Design a protein around this ligand. Sequence first.
Ligand code: SF4
Ligand SMILES: [Mg+2]
Ligand SMILES: [Zn+2]
Lengths: 83, 63, 694, 626, 80, 225, 237
Amino acid sequence: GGYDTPLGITNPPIDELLDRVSSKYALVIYAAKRARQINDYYNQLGEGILEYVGPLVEPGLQEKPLSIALREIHADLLEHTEG
Amino acid sequence: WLSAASFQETTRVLTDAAINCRSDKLNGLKENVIIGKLIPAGTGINRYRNIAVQPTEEARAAA
Amino acid sequence: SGLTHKRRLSALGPGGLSRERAGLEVRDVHPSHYGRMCPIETPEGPNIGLIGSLSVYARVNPFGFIETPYRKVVDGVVSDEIVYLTADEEDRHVVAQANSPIDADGRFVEPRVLVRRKAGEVEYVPSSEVDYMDVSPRQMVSVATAMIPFLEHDDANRALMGANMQRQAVPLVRSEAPLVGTGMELRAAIDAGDVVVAEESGVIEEVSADYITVMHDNGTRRTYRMRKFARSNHGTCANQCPIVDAGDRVEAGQVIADGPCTDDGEMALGKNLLVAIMPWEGHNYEDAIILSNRLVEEDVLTSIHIEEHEIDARDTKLGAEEITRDIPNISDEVLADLDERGIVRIGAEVRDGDILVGKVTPKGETELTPEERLLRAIFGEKAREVRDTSLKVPHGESGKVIGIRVFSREDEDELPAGVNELVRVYVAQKRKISDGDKLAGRHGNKGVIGKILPVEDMPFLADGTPVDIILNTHGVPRRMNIGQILETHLGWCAHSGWKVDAAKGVPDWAARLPDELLEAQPNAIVSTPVFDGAQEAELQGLLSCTLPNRDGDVLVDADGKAMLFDGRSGEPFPYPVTVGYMYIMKLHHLVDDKIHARSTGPYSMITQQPLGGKAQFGGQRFGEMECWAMQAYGAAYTLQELLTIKSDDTVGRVKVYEAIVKGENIPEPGIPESFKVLLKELQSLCLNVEVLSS
Amino acid sequence: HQCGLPKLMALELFKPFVMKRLVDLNHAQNIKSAKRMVERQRPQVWDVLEEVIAEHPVLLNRAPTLHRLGIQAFEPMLVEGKAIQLHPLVCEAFNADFDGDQMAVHLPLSAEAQAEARILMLSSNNILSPASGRPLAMPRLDMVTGLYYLTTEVPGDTGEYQPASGDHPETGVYSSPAEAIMAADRGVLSVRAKIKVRLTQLRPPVEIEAELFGHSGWQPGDAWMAETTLGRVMFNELLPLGYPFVNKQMHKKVQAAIINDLAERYPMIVVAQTVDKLKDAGFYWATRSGVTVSMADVLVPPRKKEILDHYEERADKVEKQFQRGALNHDERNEALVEIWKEATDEVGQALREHYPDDNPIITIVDSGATGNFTQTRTLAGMKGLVTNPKGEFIPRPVKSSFREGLTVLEYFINTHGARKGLADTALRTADSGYLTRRLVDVSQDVIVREHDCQTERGIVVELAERAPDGTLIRDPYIETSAYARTLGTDAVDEAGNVIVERGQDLGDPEIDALLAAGITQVKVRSVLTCATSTGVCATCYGRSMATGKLVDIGEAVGIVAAQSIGEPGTQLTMRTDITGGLPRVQELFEARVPRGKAPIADVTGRVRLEDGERFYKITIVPDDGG
Amino acid sequence: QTPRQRLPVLPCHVGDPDLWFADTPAGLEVAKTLCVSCPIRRQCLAAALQRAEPWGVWGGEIFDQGSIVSHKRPRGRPRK
Amino acid sequence: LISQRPTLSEDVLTDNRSQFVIEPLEPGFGYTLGNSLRRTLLSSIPGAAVTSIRIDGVLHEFTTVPGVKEDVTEIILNLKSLVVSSEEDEPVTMYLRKQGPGEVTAGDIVPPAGVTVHNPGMHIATLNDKGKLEVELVVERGRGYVPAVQNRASGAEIGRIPVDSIYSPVLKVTYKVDATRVEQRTDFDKLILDVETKNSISPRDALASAGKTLVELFGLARELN
Amino acid sequence: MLISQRPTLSEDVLTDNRSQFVIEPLEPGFGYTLGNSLRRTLLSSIPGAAVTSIRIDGVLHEFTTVPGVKEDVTEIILNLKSLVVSSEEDEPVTMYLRKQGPGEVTAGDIVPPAGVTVHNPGMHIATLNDKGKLEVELVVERGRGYVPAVQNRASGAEIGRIPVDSIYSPVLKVTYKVDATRVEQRTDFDKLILDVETKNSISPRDALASAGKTLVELFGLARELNVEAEGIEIGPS
Ligand code: SF4
Ligand SMILES: [Mg+2]
Ligand SMILES: [Zn+2]
């Protein structure tokens, strides 16, 4: 668990991420569906609230929704069940 | 048969599968590329495509 | 390259065999080629050995066979009756070798001389069956491959690449002659015809930038017009400039005017740049090249390119097109340069995408949407019943405008039917050197330009002179082209100048050296010919005595190395480093010809794939090997996306575009159009194709 | 994970994204105004473009795309200029030189596709080649020369430690590598001397730590002495904190072993940062090392004329005996071929004996950076023999070296072999593409489906057969036969206890335990014996080498297998009438009857060796009574 | 952060547009004074003159159904 | 502990080339100090050079004046070698009247107030009896090197030929240290600089400018507290 | 003219004494022109103090081991070499420490005379075992840079006075690198990233201040030759 702090696209580290899922494919689909929910919530905030809710962690200034979703998964804030 | 038509004798490969009414299965990787659906390997299998994503309820109340 | 495109022997074409029919025993080198076709030079693609060049001394028979000169040595006494022979007589007789030690009157010296035989054999014969000695060495070699110095120290692969990329240089704007070459550079320039040559001896009367009036001996005069900045066939300038004065006397055959790549008559394709062969901090890895900024500042490597753009005015079904200042609703800002009748003025600097010719086409009248009707009623504008098709400069092109040639059907000129006015604009950007451009030496050591450093953090000798290009040292031993190292050592010797100390007579290495190579001025030129050059002993002996610069300073010691400081850190390098004066060219595979991108542009008609080519936008081909790569990675979605919505799904492409622009999620892909085409074909061929749900 | 990008390309690439963003910042109120602003390239688009381009991965690809690592995903960053910059380590995977080769950029759009290019195809997560498991981000030529010069040790160098006493102490010891660095920045020390530092932040090797602390040396804290160089300390600080001290000379095989063990024991992000620090120090010490090529650094052997006269007398005697008609033409050419091969090997031996160790050319060769010794032999020594257009040898042969320069006839002879190699390389490229196409079209359906086939069958593995004197000599084919395969049954040494149970991954410590226990025949579980319907179960296939762990349940092992087999074409030379090259592989998978049909037995027992005239005829004695 | 044209500077479209069609002469006086700070009163006023406006504040000036007004009389008996 | 500070001495070889010697320094300091002064000198001395010219009979860079041996681009590459020296930072103009046969040296340029041309003997172009040459030039100030600033970046007419300029009045700078480094640990360096400048300003003035730039820069790192 | 962008300076902390400065942004170039000079001045300019030579009873020429103590003579020497101290008197002051009997000798056991200031008592220097007695003198003088062990040219003056190497300087390790921020809006301005770690006699901030002072005097030596010249200006904060 000792390294330099990762920077750019590699934060959070994938080898530490992967203990939350079973396999890389499931992790990819996990993050992509969460990012679709995030972007739908961001686009649909002008009117009344839809069934999707929020970046559960606080984002940066201009942060990509996929990166927000990955930090959520690393934050141990979601749960899922495969097909 | 759809994959088999890509090699040779496409007239011949069709014209006997036409007699047998040989329905294809769409299970390989060569045929799903042709008809433009998801390949059944990697992130295309039904274990990894029906994944439901939802927040945990201990963090639902923090929102 | 203009010279060596002629004297080319192909092998394919009508009446000849194609490349698929080219069996492997026609691309080889049959040993009758010695003197009749050069074995070095060939295109290196899928055309190796099919296309070859003539030799230097060859000559074609009345019947179309290829002759070759030979001295006719009689009874061990070498005569001078030069006798042309063909392949059959060469197979008949016994042929000697070019550098045989003749005893200064005709007699041989050693009794067992080298000989080529009938079957391509190399033997040893007593000196009485010899009846034909070669005229010279280098008879087996081409024209381009007779210009590489120290060719006999190089491998044939790298010699092939060097002689192949000697025909891709560019004409610079200064064109300095090389410090060391072979003597056959003057003849290849005055025989290439791109140098104006005086025809009768006389006295120059009046020079200019554009015409020379040579006054002959008897009354008559003659004026030689020049060609100032005419476009070549590949987009380079073809400028000429005189090299004489108003009072000189010239003789019939003297060079009077340099051409594109000439200096004082002889050929010159590049500049002499100081070089160093250490690896430098990873910026030259797997043979990249770094350069000083002095090349950019002093315009050492600065070509000129000339581009031609063309547009025309046909007759349509809905009327006739026209060339006007007036266009659809574009402001007077873009009309700041256009002349009274369309095209831009001469000298108006353009940028990317600006208007060059203002042409607007009669589009007829279509029906009106009610919303457009409401907006036009609101704003109160012209109906604009004509559609604009203006010639605009494509991406990344700029620079001045030289000439605007205009042809008209009204003006009694030859035009295709329906076309009324045909116009042509010449745009001439001056292009500096930049990273991404290709540089090459003479021995096929090419490489792109890595990082143009500033001048101060570039290593320098003890005199303060910074080097100008740093090569890499891992690329020399594994390719076997040490001709560049020998050329570099001789380049430093020829630059700094030598004087052999003949105090106690001539030293031992300088026995075979001629007179007046014992000493030479600094920055004087030499010439080593191809297969009889300077020996390594002569190179070491010249490097021993290399008279100092301004102070008492021999910057380069006996090994050829030198002591380099480091401009970035400051400390000296701990080990001495080879320096010396190489000669490198600039290649016409510049980056701006090659770089193109495409977001969304035109499309095919019969299919719906995007177009291809860099003249239009063009998109990259996504081959089946890359399909295999994506499948083996396991990314299904990227593969499906690359095969549905970026190339085929014509109703989904615009949905993707508007979803990107609005900011929503990307929608799910639809059925690609190729599958529907295949489905309709299979239904058309009386095959009851049905899909199954359950 | 980064890569460059020119701005005049990236602006064209990201045009709709930048249109949306600069409408949202009101620099242009409508889309047509945004498009005209982008076309005129007003200066606000760059400050918009950086914010729209951060953390948005793009792809790279170089045609031809041989194997799975041909397409990798990189995070872009803006480069003023016109050429795509590239990380120097990944050129080994892309097989890209810098002679003018061109790569192509694509761009993923959807959230799914960006997730795939961020997690799967990211360049930092592809270090091991899937064909063999060796690394492909290992430092190549230039940095390898740098690390070799850094970690070599020179006796007799400046400021060496000597224990010369009775008058004054050792004067070689140093309290800390900080003090050693200060002394080397002064004029005293060289990098490659031999000193006795007192390290504190480097973990000692296993034997020394067992000697001193036994087991509890937590090397964050403690202090110990070591008679290394300075350079090995300086290089060894690049490796992670837990890694034991190395103290060797960094030949390329040693660096492959270090990076392989590191990737086995540590996460990929640690491996990536380690190999990047390795690249930086490798380049910085490569430019200090003074590797230059000059004609004073190419020495001819001083015995070549004596060697050539001694072989020349034998060649002249053979030619004289053919001149008298004592033998035939093919015997003449065969004898001359043998004479000149012996002469070439003799002069190569003399050259390698003559060359000192610290020469630049032999340093580049010996480090494992590039090349072999034959190229040095041709560059100084003799060329040897050159082949024919048909392929036979020329019995002339060449007796000169490229430093001394060839003559006209010898250059003419060399041209045949040069042109032949040049054409046949492209021919072999096309044939390798054909073979890869056939193998892909056969095995494009084997994908992992279940997790456990639940059989008991399996193949056996030789694994370090017993010596006749009696010891376990390790078999040379283990990494391609026994590593990374799960165990079908357990292994028990001499009917005692088990050592490794069923289901273990069978890596190096299990290998060492089985070798120490003294067994050869294990029965690994593998595919061939997989009992699923279509595709293979995950637990049979073993450890996927691209990850270093077990495979998932969706991997396309068939396409990985086909690309890993068909990629090392264009390095399969046949020989100098039985096939032994690339077409030998081609007829194997086609399974046709080979030309060199040597028959096999049909029953055991004694045999009757028996020859007739000009062709043999052997019968076999049966023991079955048939 | 905008770097747009002079549209927020343009005091025509700063607030509610129905203010500019006020049915109270006092209520449009603020509107008429608001185009005292307008950069483009000449061309706007000229355009409104040539296009024969029927209504509203134009160029910092109200318009009748045909032409220019000083200012409209309110409801009721006009005064002395 | 050495109780001394180094004293900058001086030595003049020729009128535009002179030496400077600093002694004594710490060991391992002479190389770095000389390199810092060299990198300061070679690219950060403000000077003055011709930016844009405008001949009368031409419209762009790619033609020929009627009656000259050279052409427009050759006149450009001759004029890039000029050495002018201005006082104020504003664009001043200097002209060139020449008529009839002879040679156009650089000495025929008539400067306005402030500026001056330091090498009148430079050959620019040659003229026959039918040639007529009228060219103005613009002189700026500035430092370093700047590429050709485009015409459309300005608002000029068609005739305004732009030329990339090089204002740096220094040419070739080297050093050489001499480490005493004796066994009594009385060790010190002796930095022997060597400046040669392109006749515009004296090497003393060039070195003074470099030293003032470095002092002003290191005042920041001094000014933390 | 003007530098057109004022370079800032922002310190940092990793340990008690290991800072990591960063200067940003500079002119193109200039990162290597000031970072290398700053590194060398930091290493070899700041005064400090250390031990020059020791002399220990019992051993006069037998440099193998000392009676009573358990570790080697070389272990004692290179243990004592890493002892942080400061002084005032430019003459070579002397020291003395004495301890008998069993126990562990730490650096606080030495008695300091006037001027000297041992900045860590808590550091092991010996472990005297089984009724031994250790008596060691030390020579401390101030200095700069890092000299090697001075050869005993006065070997007739003393025979047991073994000289040692002496790290005079207070800093210990300086690394640096550059970067290439904002190549389009700011046209390739460089970001210097220093890294200085020192022993705890002084702090990195005042270390940087003293380095800047000696450098600005050294370059003002060159400046005060023609003060009426023109160079690049920065301005106020
Ligand atoms: S009416 Fe007056 S304030 Fe309103 S937009 Fe027109 S000119 Fe401007
Ligand atoms: Mg290549
Ligand atoms: Zn199985």
